[PDB]
Ligand binder design. Structure first.
Ligand SMILES: *C/C=C1/C(=C/c2[nH]c(/C=C3[NH+]=C(/C=C4\NC(=O)C(C=C)=C4C)C(C)=C\3CCC(=O)O)c(CCC(=O)O)c2C)NC(=O)[C@H]1C
Length: 319
């Protein structure tokens, strides 16, 4: 049962310390990570309402010039499909995904979801060979299916995720009923210190984070030293209230957790929820020693692997 959040910093809210960090409003930071661009749009008209300040770098033109244009004008070949894919009232975790061409090498990956009457559009560069087929997940199901018990399933799952991603460290972090956690399986680069069997306090993943991770199953920090980029305007004009960014992997990470990562020597972090009968059972928690952007198709593969593992855990715990 999480505490109510305090206002964010840009609404004059308090600075976040170790005494009050269960109240940080981590879903509404008003800013994104700088490896991509974000726009928000009205869900019926398509009118562009908010843009990240770096939008020109990715889109080829200025925020001041794109704001107020409609997606029917800007994205004539995707706007109908996007509308159809995310009708009003659909789940905020449902996504639309398209690949677009741009001035530069590779393409732009476009990911869109709906929160209330607002469409949230994320653009991130992707290379062409950075395609992942459905075989990656398909072939991986095999070793997960043959694991004979829960711990063997956890060990195969961390090894499969490390093989798919190349991450330096991949853990399965399981929550206890008091919300403390334990690393129950770990695949890691030879010579990295082991976290296997280590337990952590509940405060390391505070209650409002555990709530958010029950609904939006994947989040990441691509570069634990990168400054966030503001959305402008920072509040959603539809509501004159903060924009919920829980559903956007580009959402800026809590500064408090960015510090926690830098203290562990982590350059890039990503985790996928394992949700069992609607409760958060644990996380697939990954680190890399340097900044790294896992490509969008691999992320989506990992999400699916989390849902598959959640079912296999749920099967075995009933035994
Ligand atoms: C006073 C507030 C604190 C707190 C804030 C906090 N932590 C998170 C998110 C995560 N914490 C994680 C914990 C671990 N990563 C590990 O490697 C290990 C053990 C080896 C642990 C225990 C994890 C996995 C996450 C999820 C995100 C990720 O995978 O990188 C947040 C929310 C971050 C966000 O989504 O914006 C917050 C606010 N951590 C503290 O320790 C105290 C200081």
């Amino acid at each position: 049962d999480p505490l109510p959040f305090f206002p964010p910093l840009y609404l004059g809210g308090p600075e976040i310390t170790t005494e009050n960090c269960e109240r940080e409003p981590i879903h509404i930071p008003g800013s994104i990570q700088p490896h991509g661009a974000l726009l928000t749009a009205d869900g019926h008209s398509g009118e562009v309402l908010q843009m990240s300040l770096n939008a020109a770098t990715f889109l080829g033109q200025e925020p001041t010039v794109l704001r107020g244009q409609t997606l029917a004008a800007l994205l004539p070949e995707q706007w109908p499909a996007l509308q159809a894919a995310l009708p009003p009232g659909c789940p905020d975790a449902l996504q639309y995904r398209a690949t677009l061409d741009w001035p530069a090498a590779g393409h732009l990956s476009l990911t869109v979801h709906r929160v209330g009457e607002l469409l949230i559009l994320e653009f991130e560069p992707t290379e062409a060979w950075d395609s992942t087929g459905p075989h990656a997940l398909r072939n991986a199901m095999f070793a997960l299916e043959s694991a004979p018990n829960l711990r063997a399933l956890a060990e195969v799952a961390t090894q499969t995720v490390r093989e798919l991603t190349g991450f330096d460290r991949v853990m399965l972090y399981k929550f206890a009923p008091d919300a403390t956690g334990e690393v129950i399986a770990e695949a890691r680069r030879e010579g990295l210190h082991a976290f296997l069997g280590h337990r952590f306090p509940a405060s390391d993943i505070p209650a409002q984070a555990r709530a958010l991770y029950t609904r939006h199953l994947l989040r990441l920090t691509a570069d634990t030293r990168a400054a966030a980029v503001p959305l402008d305007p920072v509040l959603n004009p539809q509501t004159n209230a903060p924009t919920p960014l829980g559903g956007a992997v580009l959402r800026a990470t809590s500064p408090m957790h960015m510090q926690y990562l830098r203290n562990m020597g982590v350059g890039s972090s990503l985790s996928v929820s394992v949700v069992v009968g609607g409760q958060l059972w644990g996380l697939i928690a990954c680190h890399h020693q340097t900044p790294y952007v896992l490509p969008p198709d691999l992320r989506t593969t990992l999400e699916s692997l989390g849902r598959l593992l959640s079912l296999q855990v749920q099967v075995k715990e009933a035994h």
